[PDB]
């Protein structure tokens, strides 16, 4: 039985923080871990017009919200679960765990 953990965030530094924390968690003990694996970055694009009126040449603002995604597999041992679940996650990162 193995455990998979998915990380999503807008900030890369927090991602690296959590991933290196769990990497040390898994290296102190001898356990097999794959990754972290980078998934395609997802962008929410929104193009809109600047002027609040209709007069004048048309001009457009293009806003983007980027989301980076990492995947990890941890082999799901008791010690690993114990000393992993006890890590304060920075609020700018979402993390979801589940066993295969």
């Amino acid at each position: 039985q193995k455990a998979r953990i998915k990380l999503a965030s807008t900030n890369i530094k927090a991602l690296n923080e959590v991933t290196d924390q769990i990497k040390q968690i898994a290296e102190r003990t001898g356990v097999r871990m794959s990754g972290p694996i980078p998934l395609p970055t997802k962008r929410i694009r929104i193009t809109t017009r600047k002027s609040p009126d209709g007069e004048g040449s048309a001009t457009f603002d293009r806003f983007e919200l980027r989301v980076h995604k990492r995947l990890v597999d941890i082999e799901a041992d008791e010690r690993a679960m114990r000393q992993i679940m006890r890590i304060r996650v920075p609020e700018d990162v979402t993390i979801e765990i589940e066993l295969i």
Binding site: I44, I46, T48, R49, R62, F63, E64, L65, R66
Partner: protein
Amino acid sequence: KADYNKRKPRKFGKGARRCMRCGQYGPIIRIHGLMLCRHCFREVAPKLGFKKYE
């Protein structure tokens, strides 16, 4: 007797989507659950985290 002042429960149409901030009806970006107008979004986007990045 006091009900001739209330709207109807629209499910579709332009009268079914007001802006959470101003109250406009027509132009709603409506992308990813954004019930904001094209005038207020362009002003509150950085507060939400959007950037230009072109």
